[PDB]
Write a protein that binds this ligand. Sequence first.
Ligand SMILES: O=C1C[C@@H](C(=O)O)NC(=O)N1
Ligand SMILES: O=C1C[C@@H](C(=O)O)NC(=O)N1
Ligand SMILES: [Zn+2]
Ligand SMILES: [Zn+2]
Lengths: 422, 422
Amino acid sequence: MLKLIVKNGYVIDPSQNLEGEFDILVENGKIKKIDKNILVPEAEIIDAKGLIVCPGFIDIHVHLRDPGQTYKEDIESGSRCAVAGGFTTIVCMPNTNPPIDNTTVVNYILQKSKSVGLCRVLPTGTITKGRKGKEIADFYSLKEAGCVAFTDDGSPVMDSSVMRKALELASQLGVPIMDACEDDKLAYGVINEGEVSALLGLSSRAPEAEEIQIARDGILAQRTGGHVHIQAVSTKLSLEIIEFFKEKGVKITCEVNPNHLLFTEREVLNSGANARVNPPLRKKEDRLALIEGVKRGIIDCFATDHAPHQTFEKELVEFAMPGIIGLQTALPSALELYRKGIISLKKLIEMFTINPARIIGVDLGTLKLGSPADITIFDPNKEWILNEETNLSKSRNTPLWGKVLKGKVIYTIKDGKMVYKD
Amino acid sequence: MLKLIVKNGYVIDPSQNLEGEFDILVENGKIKKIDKNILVPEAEIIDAKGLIVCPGFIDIHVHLRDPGQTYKEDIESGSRCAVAGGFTTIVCMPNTNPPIDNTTVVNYILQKSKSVGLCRVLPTGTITKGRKGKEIADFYSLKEAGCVAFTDDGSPVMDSSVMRKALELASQLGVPIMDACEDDKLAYGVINEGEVSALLGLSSRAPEAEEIQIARDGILAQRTGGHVHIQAVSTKLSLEIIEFFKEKGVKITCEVNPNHLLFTEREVLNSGANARVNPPLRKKEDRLALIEGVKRGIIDCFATDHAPHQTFEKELVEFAMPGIIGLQTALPSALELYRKGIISLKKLIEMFTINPARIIGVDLGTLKLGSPADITIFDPNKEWILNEETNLSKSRNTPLWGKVLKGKVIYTIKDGKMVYKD
Ligand SMILES: O=C1C[C@@H](C(=O)O)NC(=O)N1
Ligand SMILES: O=C1C[C@@H](C(=O)O)NC(=O)N1
Ligand SMILES: [Zn+2]
Ligand SMILES: [Zn+2]
């Protein structure tokens, strides 16, 4: 590995308004040149003919379950999922055990991720000590150790001064707060407060629980000057509120879990506990609004909230752990919107690359000369099935289990090294 | 009293798009006819020549301090203030002692107000038992006894399900929630979080405390179908948020304390503790936004939050009770906006009459044929001073104490009976 060439693919680099049939030369893990028919003496070649070539995808919302819940997933299994899904960078959430609220846990993750060596794993810290919601965590030490953001995911912050103080201390450090928006007085049940909760009598989680905290966060972001990133947006009103603050110049970004683009609460009737997730799958009108928010640029990126749980944690809905895996299914799920002509291919790539890069302030999601050779190569049309043959997660918890997907990664490249191939 | 005629005044009844020089005939406490030069055998006459004749003003935010704090004010002293200020109807707040959370306190107030016999006093109930914020109050019994709305004024409701449940049970009964919007984690100091708190080191109350709860209430109103009325709006962002929900068809109304139209936090430096109020007086930009919200119809009515406290409760700002009296000063204060050409005279009257009537769902604030003869007659140009000679409150707590006011009530009429004259 001095020299690599990605030949004959259809390159798309939205960060540079760059697209067409170009080759890419990689030198020492870095992007060296992008040009028609490049040829160099003694080069590694991967042939991308008929395929899409773009920056490595970045997922800013992943649960690696490591430390403490490694029977669900661990840094290795999650990293394999990531790269098999086209991700060269993932941000891991801090609801591990022990939680990421000290530099020992950060370092453990960084070192283990280096040993695994497939994608870049960027840790976040908790907003509060122990994620108990009471006292701000040591942002200064956690950022210095490598945390890129603070969240209490998957717990909301209930005290408004705690959230304000988080935003103040984080912005002072130049990093965002990622907020898990669900007021715990209005969201302590198991599924959406809609038709399915009404029909079955399952306890519910009110859409206002999410909306009220998003509105709170926009106001706090506005008044503190901090940047708040809203995780897994799930309702129409939510998007309206976000846009209202974006219109004012507030540093508020957001993401959508592709599952919320594909499924409604009705999925609880078809997939049972594999449709239990926080925030819940909500109504048709919400699903369609989300797609509209993707189209209109209100939703800044796709992020999986890859949240693996074992099958015995996905039995009776009432007792089931919330969450859906998604790293391996993000791309075909997104490509569904491309196929319906809702978004362009460039737009889909933006949402996986440069947009998430800008949210967390990393110079990635790009094929700019001199930048790391993180490259994803994919077939928008290749069909496959997520099943035992194909699943890289330790867990299986997704309503897309066993269903036909269209769109698939052929190559994932990280610092000029092929870390995944079909 | 069979027959009364209000002669030669300039009548304005915005509810009917009615204005001009007309006489008003009153028969048995009711409006009988409105016409040019009416004359009837053996009639009482009050001459309104050169004066403005309009429906009695309604103030939907008054502290009567009765029961329990009658050294501040009582039903009698507050009613005299009301009528001297042009108000034939006031809504009293439930932060009395004991608070209005049972039908005994409601009935005491209704009966005492009947005995006093000057203006109609309409009680509200608390949102929570004891106003402690934990358990919803008995709305059903309180409404049946005569309460027209529920509020925990001057305490916010901190639990979101409590507020949601209040809105649900109130809308079921057809009555609004009036919410005192100030998140207690962000508003536990004494003055605005602005220049004056920074300069002096007085504890502060963050504008976001108000904004976050208004945003919460709009969302709750939207999702429950209830009507929420936002009390004493004080910031620019607040008005933006309200308008955002009004635009969506949400039943959300609001009011402005005229003091917030006249004064900023700087008044704490000139008037000391008589400028201590919740929500606080904020910045110039907020003051001007409020005036703009009055102009653009975002603010639905004027309401005084008449909040009397004794002089010994208005000494060192840190220990002072929050609040400003305002019933006698509301009209000249409002007329300041008329004089600057910010609002028309019709608009000023709307904000004191039909708009507050519609908020609380009473058929008042009108000179419609058959309706109660509640009539206010005033001189927009008459100068006076609020001082010992002129004050009808038991308390003196207003930065307008001793200052020249322009605009003054000459007559107040309630059910055809003259209850006040200059
Ligand atoms: O907020 C969350 C956290 C997550 C998890 O399992 O970590 N699963 C979810 O469904 N929602
Ligand atoms: O919320 C409130 C209540 C009031 C009072 O004294 O009742 N005074 C105020 O200044 N704000
Ligand atoms: Zn998560
Ligand atoms: Zn009040």
